[PDB]
Amino acid sequence: ECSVDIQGNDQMQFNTNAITVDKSCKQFTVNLSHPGNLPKNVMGHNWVLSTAADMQGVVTDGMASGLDKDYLKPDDSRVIAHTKLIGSGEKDSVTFDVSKLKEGEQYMFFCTFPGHSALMKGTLTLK
Ligand SMILES: [Ca+2]
Ligand SMILES: [Cu+2]
């Protein structure tokens, strides 16, 4: 109930492209880990959640903020929730309120490390 375990690996892949959140959930938790051996500054990953329309800007601003900010704009109002940036062998979790999500909206999740969102993205939907 109300959580998903997700991996980002050394091939610039997340192990899901569609996350389902049961609608009765008050808080939803994403548990990110990084198998593999590459360090954070070479193939670090985070998990970041925004509306479909906000994704591109979150990504572009993230790249501009740089590594030392985990490739995310500090207090970006468009980020519904995010993990830390992690490298191999690390993990991080985040929990966010399900009330921050609305029926009929389309949410995307992605990694903001530069370039990774080309393949490391997917949908998040209420079920
Ligand atoms: Ca945390
Ligand atoms: Cu990544």
From Swiss-Prot:
Disulfide bonds join 2-25. CDD domains: Azurin (cd13922). Its main location: periplasm. Residues 1-127 form the Plastocyanin-like domain. The keyword Electron transport applies. InterPro entries: Azurin, BlueCu_1, BlueCu_1_BS, Cu-binding_ET, Cupredoxin. Keywords: Copper, Disulfide bond, Electron transport, Metal-binding, Periplasm, Signal, Transport. It is found in: Periplasm. Transfers electrons from cytochrome c551 to cytochrome oxidase. NCBIfam families: azurin. PANTHER family: AURACYANIN-B, OUTER MEMBRANE PROTEIN H.8. This is Azurin. It comes from Pseudomonas aeruginosa (strain ATCC 15692 / DSM 22644 / CIP 104116 / JCM 14847 / LMG 12228 / 1C / PRS 101 / PAO1). The gene is azu.
